[PDB]
């Protein structure tokens, strides 16, 4: 991990020459199917962050992730207006269908008690960070897909006040800022 981190420094011509869609697609699919959102962090590091907005690779990675054929990796929100205090984010865990059952209980799970209920918000924070670091300046064909989601009121209602998010709380602002 450390050697491939040091190879993946600023390095413009390496990003636009020796990196193709196939190897990152295997990195997007095969490594990412199981667990461990540190690989999601390294995928986000490969995407843009040299200093500001490598444009050639950010429009290759987005079509590797944001297509509906590559769904069930990211976590989406719906605002099903159930029963003030209506918001839900939906995640699957390696075997079966949507089940979420809450998001306010994750604030109760933010202190201690579970591991499968504590990995979910960390994975959500990291994929929020990847969405913020996806285009962030000029790439338009994949900023339109993330325009409908978290559009106007959903990003503000999740970032009004809550018991105990700190890093995800900053992740909402970071996705706001771009």
UniProtKB/Swiss-Prot annotation:
Origin: domain of life: Eukaryota
Subcellular location: Endoplasmic reticulum membrane; Cytoplasmic vesicle, Secretory vesicle membrane; Cytoplasm, Perinuclear region
Ligand binding (Ca(2+) 1): 138
Record PTM: Polyubiquitinated. Polyubiquitination targets ITPR1 for proteasomal degradation. Approximately 40% of the ITPR1-associated ubiquitin is monoubiquitin, and polyubiquitins are both 'Lys-48'- and 'Lys-63'-linked.
UniProt note: domains: The ITPR1 structure has a large solenoid CY assembly built around the central helical bundle made of the C-terminal domains from four ITPR1 subunits. The solenoid scaffold includes domains responsible for binding of ligands and regulatory proteins and is connected via an allosteric nexus at the cytosolic-membrane interface to the transmembrane channel assembly. Six transmembrane helices from each subunit form the central ion-conduction pore.
Family statement: Belongs to the InsP3 receptor family.
Subunit structure: Homotetramer. Homodimer. Interacts with ERP44 in a pH-, redox state- and calcium-dependent manner which results in the inhibition the calcium channel activity. The strength of this interaction inversely correlates with calcium concentration. Part of cGMP kinase signaling complex at least composed of ACTA2/alpha-actin, CNN1/calponin H1, PLN/phospholamban, PRKG1 and ITPR1. Interacts with IRAG1. Interacts with CABP1 (via N-terminus). Interacts with TESPA1.
Protein function: Inositol 1,4,5-trisphosphate-gated calcium channel that, upon inositol 1,4,5-trisphosphate binding, mediates calcium release from the endoplasmic reticulum (ER). Undergoes conformational changes upon ligand binding, suggesting structural flexibility that allows the channel to switch from a closed state, capable of interacting with its ligands such as 1,4,5-trisphosphate and calcium, to an open state, capable of transferring calcium ions across the ER membrane. Cytoplasmic calcium released from the ER triggers apoptosis by the activation of CAMK2 complex.
Record-given protein name: Inositol 1,4,5-trisphosphate-gated calcium channel ITPR1
């Amino acid at each position: 991990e450390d050697t491939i981190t040091a190879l993946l420094h600023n390095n413009r011509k390496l990003l636009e020459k020796h990196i193709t869609a196939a190897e990152i697609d295997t990195f997007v699919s095969l490594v990412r199917k199981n667990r461990e959102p540190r690989f999601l962090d390294y995928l986000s590091d490969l995407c843009v962050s040299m200093n500001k907005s490598i444009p050639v690779t950010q429009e290759l990675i987005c079509k590797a992730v944001l297509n509906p054929t590559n769904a069930d990796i990211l976590i989406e929100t719906k605002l099903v207006l159930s029963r003030e205090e209506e918001v839900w984010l939906f995640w699957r865990d390696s075997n079966k269908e949507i089940r979420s059952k809450s998001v306010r209980e994750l604030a109760q799970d933010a202190k201690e008690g579970q591991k499968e209920d504590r990995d979910v918000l960390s994975y959500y924070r990291y994929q929020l960070n990847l969405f913020a670091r996806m285009c962030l300046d000029r790439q338009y064909l994949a900023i339109n897909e993330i325009s409908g989601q978290l559009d106007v009121d959903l990003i503000l209602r999740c970032m009004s006040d809550e018991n105990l998010p700190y890093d995800l709380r900053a992740s909402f602002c970071r996705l706001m800022l771009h």
